[PDB]
Amino acid sequence: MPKVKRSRKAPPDGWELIEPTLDELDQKMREAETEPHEGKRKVESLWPIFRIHHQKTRYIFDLFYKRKAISRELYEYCIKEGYADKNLIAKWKKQGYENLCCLRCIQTRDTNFGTNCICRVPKSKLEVGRIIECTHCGCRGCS
């Protein structure tokens, strides 16, 4: 029923107060894996995976850098077990990059002209009020 752990040592100290929500996020991810595509476009059906992955990683990130509610050990346990993304966090700690979607949406090898997605353009520099949905992600304006 839960995620099979791969550490086999017991989880660290403050585990028991973050587990209902981690399992609730984990139950939410298993919904999105099994949704049948019908009226969902070919790229659109993968958008919930990136959203929930953002959410799980944001949750551990808030409990350790904002709320200071978790030690290094419980933090690095959640990264090793796959609850949080190590690389997505390392971009959120950068200066401009603090509500980033994905690592796809800043990867310049993934685009034709070698650039970020329009996801990453500040909404004030589009100056028109056009509506954006990133094809990688579904995002409407990180930056």
Partner RNA sequence: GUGCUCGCUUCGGCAGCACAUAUACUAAAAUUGGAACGAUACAGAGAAGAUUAGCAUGGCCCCUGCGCAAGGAUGACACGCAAAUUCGUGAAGCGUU
CB 108 within 8 A of CB 115: yes
Least distance (Å) between residue 70 CB and Zn ion:
26
Residue 27 identity (one-letter amino acid) = Q
Q: Does 78 bind RNA (CB under 7 A)?
A: no
Q: Does 42 bind RNA (CB under 7 A)?
A: yes
Calpha distance 103→120 (Å, rounded): 11
Q: Does 88 bind RNA (CB under 7 A)?
A: no
Q: Is 108 exposed, middle or buried (0-12, 13-18, 19+ CB in 10 A)?
A: exposed
Least distance (Å) between residue 31 CB and RNA:
20
- Which chain residues interact with Zn ion by CB under 5 A? 101-102, 105, 117, 119, 134, 136-137, 139, 142
Query: Is the Cα dihedral 15, 16, 22, 26 positive or negative?
Result: positive
**Which of the choices Zn ion, RNA, none does residue 109 contact, using the CB cut-off of 5 to 8 A by kind?**
none
Least distance (Å) between residue 13 CB and Zn ion:
34
